Symmetry: D2
């Protein structure tokens, strides 16, 4: 039995979900809520659905199950609430808002709506990382002791974006912070170091173009996250899980398996994927297939609204540690 879905937003992120839905049998798109209606009808009219300007138009309906929220990160709150107060399961993108307060206000109002809200942490749904998480849980490498994550964007985003980014910790490291919890949910301490090695731009906005985070798990686990705002070879996304009986790591993905060998060098492979949509193509699809299972059930979604709350809390904690030169205790006593 198929299910209907409503698609908020129509920007870069909106095209992905829309298209993946059509490919999935158990789902069908029907509308798009975006102020820039001209850019909302270049996606709605696309898959065979209608398009509006304001959200209220959609919130003034009565034939939609899933709510794939895909608009700016500072509007999500105002869109998740009105989906909970209508008992319709939703799936959002960037973790709630950038302001922790607004986020808490959202939790309270929706009370336990955090059950009906699956977050868009697509990395958990990547086959490679998901496999490592599952295999680790299956005790394949003994007790998890160390988790190393290396993430480097190809280059800094446009100046305008950096201004409303919320800082590297809230804008970038946050995805890594969530991945950490995916493996070790109970983080007790946060230590972070920030630097400025190449971006003059990022520098004046008093943000970092490079950081390293070390988290402590409730059982002695050390999660080490390395970040950088640029990377000449592509979108570096590695992860290493080290345990008592072995190690599991994920390599980067290249478009082909071709390798060149000549007088200058051997084993020359392609640069790795330079765009997050490419690298995580399968992930978004799997995430959607999971959003479908949680609807056919109703037990709740994972990652949920709460996961996003803590992720942001981890990011702010990282920022405080970086500015203070000391380890931050997440929850005292």
């Amino acid at each position: 039995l198929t299910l209907r879905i409503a698609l908020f937003g129509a920007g870069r992120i909106g095209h992905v979900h829309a298209a993946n839905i059509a490919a999935n049998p158990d789902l069908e798109l029907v509308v798009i809520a975006d102020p820039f209606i001209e850019g909302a009808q270049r996606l709605a009219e696309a898959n065979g659905a209608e398009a509006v300007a304001s959200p209220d138009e959609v919130f003034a309906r009565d034939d939609i199950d899933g709510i794939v929220i895909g608009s700016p990160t500072s509007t999500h709150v105002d869109l998740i609430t009105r989906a909970v107060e209508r008992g319709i399961p939703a799936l959002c993108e960037k973790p709630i808002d950038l302001d922790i307060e607004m986020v808490r206000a959202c939790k309270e109002k929706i009370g336990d709506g955090a059950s009906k809200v699956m977050l868009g942490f697509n990395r958990r749904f990547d086959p490679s990382f998901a496999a490592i998480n599952a295999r680790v849980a299956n005790q394949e490498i003994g007790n998890l002791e160390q988790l190393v994550i290396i993430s480097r964007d190809p280059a800094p985003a446009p100046k305008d974006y950096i201004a409303g980014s919320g800082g590297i910790f809230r804008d970038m490291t946050i995805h890594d912070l969530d991945m950490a919890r995916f493996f070790v949910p109970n983080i007790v301490e946060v230590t972070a170091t920030g630097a400025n090695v190449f971006s003059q731009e990022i520098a004046e906005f008093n943000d970092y173009d490079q950081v390293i985070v070390t988290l402590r798990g409730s059982k002695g686990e050390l999660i080490n996250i390395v970040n950088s705002r640029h990377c000449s070879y592509g979108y570096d996304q590695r992860l290493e899980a080290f345990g008592s009986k072995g190690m599991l790591a994920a390599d980067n993905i290249r478009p082909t398996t071709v390798r060149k060998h000549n007088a200058e060098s051997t084993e020359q492979a392609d640069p790795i994927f330079n765009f997050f949509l490419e690298r995580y193509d399968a992930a978004y699809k799997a995430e959607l297939a999971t959003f479908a299972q949680g609807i056919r059930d109703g037990q709740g979604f994972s990652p949920n609204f709460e996961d996003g709350v803590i992720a942001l809390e981890l990011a702010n904690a990282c920022l405080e540690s970086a500015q203070t030169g000391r380890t931050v205790t997440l929850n005292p006593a």
Copy 2:
């Protein structure tokens, strides 16, 4: 203008094409034919299309822009002819036929209509293999001197399939023989060696469960093909191009980039893809897109009918060489 496609065969390959046609935005599947009606109806409704059991019912339509032939080999000459006689382009799974004489007869009846036939040698459309071909053509490694291909199927097909497959050369090596021509169009000599090392079943049909082929190109190029009818770690599909200035080789593909390291061994990766449909997912989609563009251009197809004829002739030359213990010259003096 969306192109209308008729599909023959509701089998496994049929499922791939149907799903790819749906996904392709320039195409639309309007009818599926398969004597096994329930099978066709099942696939048709899953793609919003009609289902018929006979080709007569297909050709009764007057809106067919293109045809995909994914039905049994014994139906290839018939479907190709009917489609071409009606000026309808046809993408046909290899081979044209197992009998070179029937292939010749067909070529005569259709005459110039042969230009509307595209042969489904999907491996040419594999990103990795296609990249290697284009980069070699671009002189990246100088003059091509050797081409080493290693293809090993996971296991022998079912008995009934083996019975009418026409032998390892016409059924399996044929794909490698075409890949060879993709790189070196002009082959002058053929040498082949067959053996029987594990399969009682393959030996029962007077066929080989493993062969080695060495082709001589018009300029001294040596193409070396290695085949086996079983492979414990998956569907082995490697290719190496060696030239005067370097080598380009393609590795196998795995479902994840995960590697395990413990006391037993390091760099442990997943077994490689086991099914052709998975290994060549991208290839089939790229092949379909090329078919669509050929329908729009009317400028012909590649691989073409002729590539299908020569591929079979090379396979026949292989069998003859293997049975005689000598090299076979394709074009006498």
Copy 3:
């Protein structure tokens, strides 16, 4: 042209240096000093040198223009001093002493005669790590921005060694701290995090079995070191240099290049070397050749005494950071 050398100690490290000295055509061992003279006699007799018990006997000689301290830590500060007196070039092993005061006290005595002392930080001489250092210095990857070092010993050392080791930072991490300086000589800040996840024995000795160090270089370089007291697959010794124009990394080393592929896993390689002596065979040899070329030049050494001092200081700095949970500034204002 040759140079006489005198080794102190006949333990594991002693054997290694002796053979290397004999191996190097420009050198030749003459005597070995060790309180367990029985072995000293045995070993020497296998090279072509005499055997004594205490340093006094070695100091009752007048034919020593090369010194090597393979003897235990307790005798390091002792021999270095008693050797600079006669002004003879020397090469000591691991850390001058675990006690920084003793080091300062030693530095205060030899005063300027520290320029003749070389430190046995063999890793700097490994062909792989050294190549990376030199290539980075040659601007091959632009400006160095990140350095990630992952070291993991196969298993903990005997209970007695752990008791008198001086902690993971002084005993293990110190090698990585020097490697960090080999790349970024100037370190401004230190941050360390320790934990206990598997060794009860290490826990009762108030030591850590896991630690993560992040050092801030004078120009914003972030150096990230990861350590662990056990490793199921071998002696993990990886290093990664990340710059503005690329990245250089070193893999672990295996005894053979054999790879196995089957139904369980593909690309299975051998477990990596599990003994530091095997892994750094080439390093120790290069370390010696550099020592010799230094003596046959009288231009000092590298690594030198000052490097060992700073190394212990970083170690102590790390410990200080781990216990307080705060970043430590090496030189205030």
Copy 4:
């Protein structure tokens, strides 16, 4: 009791054995022979041995426990005969002779003296190739079904060397043909194919600069050898053993484990070793030790005289196969 060795040849190969004899604790080099006395003297002097110009001067001594023949092929038969008739064990480099008749003449003359001849097919002693041979023998990958060997020399040897080399099969493939027997002793058929794609010099001497060989084993095993007289990235020496339960392959060797990653390509490794002395360092040393052991045991050597015989008979068969474009049956009925 240190065995005394006499070395014939002060050239490239002679230099390697000499250095290894010195290094080896169970051996002592007492005399080197070479018509070019200056080289023999120069080398001997660097090994505390004596230098003479003729074999007579070597056989005038009565203390020789073993002989190593590293002199030109034209002297192999003479030196093997003289040594064996005097009861002296002899390790001889590839080819007893290039002429199978002279080889047979030698065998007829020395009779049971052949048991004192070890053939220097050093590749069997490579740790990697040897490990694979042993693991296959231990049934690790089931029944051996295919063996693929790819050998590419960095470049053609000097003209004069090529002039008296006896062709690519006798000079180059012979090592691969021996490797084949190391895995499958019983070969029943030979098929070979040669081409001329780059070297005017090789074509000038009616030789091939490129060959592909396929051997049939007594149980249907297929051994496939690929050769080329040039290779831009180094000395390509790969081997792949494919069995019913898996596969074992050996990768090429590089000087370091360094890999570069930038905008052009990722995983860039060093060019592989370009000199056989570098690639087979461990093998030559292991081969010498095996020679030393055989001298003490008196049980015989492996590879033995017959291996040298059959390896040549196989090379001749390959040439005959290539010239006639027909498969050759090794043992007619």
